[PDB]
DNA sequence: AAAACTATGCATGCTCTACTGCTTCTGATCTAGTCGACC
């Protein structure tokens, strides 16, 4: 139940974000997907296990996508 | 010496106050099921 967390449970809520849509009256929505993931990481510092950025691997053929999949 | 008045004990009924047993109401607990929302 992440839905719900529980008092008495170890583990915690942590949030990975992937996508900025607006920040300072600047509106992000039709940038491009490059810019948004730049301006992501000037946003927040990430702190480990309650805030993170998702990393995102450059790739350019398909034995790279079944790499990692498998 | 005989008769009338009064005292005390006892029977009698009725009324009132504790104790036991049956029935019903409430509280507490457990178990089963439903719904919101996600994926």
Request: net charge neutral.
């Given at each position: ?10 583990l ?59």
């Open positions: 139940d992440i839905k719900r967390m529980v008092e008495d449970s170890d915690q809520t942590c949030y990975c974000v992937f996508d900025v849509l607006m920040v300072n009256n600047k509106k992000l929505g039709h940038e491009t997907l490059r810019k948004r993931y730049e301006i992501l990481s000037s946003i927040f510092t990430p702190i480990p296990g309650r805030i993170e950025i998702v990393q995102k691997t450059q790739a350019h053929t398909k034995n790279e996508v079944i790499d990692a999949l498998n």
